[PDB]
Amino acid sequence: SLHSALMEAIHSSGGREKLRKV
Amino acid sequence: TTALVCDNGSGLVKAGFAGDDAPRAVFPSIVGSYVGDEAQSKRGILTLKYPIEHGIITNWDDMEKIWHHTFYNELRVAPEEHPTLLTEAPLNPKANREKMTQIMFETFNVPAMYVAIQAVLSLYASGRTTGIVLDSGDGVTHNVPIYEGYALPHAIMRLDLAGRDLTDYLMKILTERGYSFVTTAEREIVRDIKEKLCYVALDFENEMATAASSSSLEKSYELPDGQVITIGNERFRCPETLFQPSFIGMESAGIHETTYNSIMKCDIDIRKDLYANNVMSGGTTMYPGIADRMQKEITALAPSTMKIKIIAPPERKYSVWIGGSILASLSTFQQMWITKQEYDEAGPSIVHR
Ligand SMILES: Nc1ncnc2c1ncn2[C@@H]1O[C@H](COP(=O)(O)OP(=O)(O)OP(=O)(O)O)[C@@H](O)[C@H]1O
Ligand SMILES: [Ca+2]
Ligand SMILES: [Ca+2]
């Protein structure tokens, strides 16, 4: 299920650390 | 073809590009016609309106001027080339969400769009999918318990007491101290004082006693004309309003109680996870010492054996936008966008999935 996959992505996304610095 | 993220608040608009760690454009959610800072400076010959009240869009023609100012004047991007993710307040009426979708597709011609609940984005920003968010900005404060990305509708709490209310209160107690702030220019200054010298006291009564006997808690703020504004208990009496709304004549319980009442309106089986995942979001949660105070207030209200945890990221002034940046740039989310073909064929109600 993509919803379970979406929940998984947010947990393993890494948060703001994986975003490009401005 | 990079997604855009627009987080529309009662007082501030946060806009940017999905993938960035912070919004590039931040400006006042005001329409004078002039939008944002331009309207704030030229206020004498113009009447200012806030198209978003207590997080709800209540003026669509002015809201359209704000989105136009966001896309072309501030971000200088073509809306027709970018999927656009917008944010909404919890319990936002269905009619509002449809109007939002119609304007994005018919006026700005976006290729794709999405509408996410602000508090949910804040939870994501902190790497969580379950927890309870305390979202407090300029116009409204909400308690939002969330179960795996779903906001529990019956447990959501709305409190019309936020930054602007604390600014008004600061202006009043500063005048009662000897200073006088009445003009709007004096309001922008008091707002700056609030954000620079205010803090939440761990023990309000003891802090009051400490302030009245010594000057160790006093801080100074100098105006351009040379006047030095020195304040003591006004530093913590202003944000104290969050925990004692009666300071400004409101009968509602403080943010610590609305958090508890919200957790108590959820299934007993989810309260444990909520207690351990209190995420603080919004500019009005930036006061130094607010996290420790919540920890103390919630501990006094929850079962003695309950593990309490308050998460207050240093970037919580933009947690909503950050959560959206993360959401809209994830690959698992690309099939969740509402496309132009869906809208062109089914219309604005398609936003309800
Ligand atoms: N360091 C600070 N201390 C106290 N308050 C602050 C600080 N920084 C910003 N604020 C306040 O936060 C408010 C803006 O925060 P935010 O952008 O989250 O609200 P908003 O989204 O515009 O409004 P709402 O969410 O209520 O619709 C303003 O009232 C501002 O004065
Ligand atoms: Ca907000
Ligand atoms: Ca149960």
| List of domains in chain B | 1-27+54-119+319-352 (3.30.420.40), 28-53 (2.30.36.70), 120-166+256-318 (3.30.420.40), 167-255 (3.90.640.10)
Q: State the DSSP code for B139.
A: S
Mutation for B interface: A2, A3, A18, A19, most B CBs within 10 A: A19
Measured between CB atoms, does B21 come within 8 Å of chain A? yes
Handedness of CA B308, B314, B319, B322 (dihedral sign): negative
User: Which residues, in sequence order, are CB contacts of B320 under 8 Å at separation 6+?
Assistant: B7, B9, B14, B87, B118, B119, B121, B122, B125, B135, B281, B282
Q: Do A21 and B124 touch (CB under 8 A)?
A: no
Select from B207, B205, B226 the least CA-distant residue to B218.
Answer: B207
Q: Whose CA is nearest to atom 6 of ligand 1?
A: B283
Residue nearest to atom 19 of ligand 1 (CA): B137
Q: B322 and A19: CB-CB below 8 Å? A: yes
CA B263 – CA B136 distance, rounded (Å) = 17
Select from B147, B167, B156 the least CA-distant residue to B261: B156
CA distance B129 to chain A (A): 6
**Residue B323, SS3?**
helix
Put simply, the answer to whether B124 touches A10 (Cβ < 8 Å) is yes
Pairwise CB contact (< 8 Å): B315 & A16:
yes
Q: Which atom of ligand 1 is nearest to the CA of B13?
A: 22
| Experimental approach taken | X-ray
**What residues flank ligand 1, with Cβ below 6 Å?**
B 9-12, 55, 137-140, 162-164, 191, 194-195, 282-284, 286-287, 317
B/e letters for B8-37, b = 16+ CB within 10 Å, e = fewer, are bbbbbbbbbbbebbbbebbbbbbbbebbbe
Q: What angle is formed at CA B158 by the lines to CA B157 and CA B160, rounded to 5 degrees?
A: 150
Are B10 and B59 in contact by the 8 Å Cβ rule? The answer is no
The closest alpha carbon to B289, from B236, B246, B237, belongs to: B236
DSSP B70: I
Asked if A1 reaches chain B (Cβ–Cβ under 8 Å), the answer is no
Q: Exposed/middle/buried for B59, CB within 10 Å: 0-12, 13-18, 19+?
A: middle
Helices (H), B214-313: 234-240, 255-264, 268-275, 290-301
C-alpha to C-alpha distance for B145 and B152, rounded to whole angstroms: 6
CA angle (B258, B88, B82) in 5-degree steps: 150
Question: Are A13 and B148 inside 8 Å of each other by CB?
Answer: no
For the record, the structure tokens of B313 come out as: 């990221």
CA of B338 relative to ligand 3 center, distance in Å? 34
Residue B110, helix vs strand vs coil: coil
Gap between the Cα atoms of B266 and B153, Å rounded: 10
Is B322 within 8 Å of A16 when comparing Cβ atoms?
Answer: yes
Q: Is B334 on the interface with A (CB under 8 A)?
A: no
Cross-strand bridge partners of residue B15: B6, B25
What stretch of H or E contains B147? Answer: strand B141-147
> Among the atoms of ligand 1, which is closest to the Cα of residue B14?
17
**Is-contact B315 A19, C-beta < 8 A?**
no
Please choose, from the candidates B328, B287, B325, B294, the residue with its C-alpha nearest in 3D space to the C-alpha of residue B309: B294
**C-alpha B118: how far from chain center:** 8
Whether B330 contacts B19, CB under 8 Å? no
The DSSP symbol for B282 reads S
What is the spatial distance between Cα B51 and Cα B167, in angstroms, rounded to a whole number?
20
Which DSSP string do the residues of B37-48 spell out, in sequence order? HHHHHT-TTS--
Query: Is residue B116 within 8 angstroms of chain A, CB to CB?
Result: no
Top residue of B14, B277, B330, B335 to mutate, by most chain A CBs within 10 Å, is B330
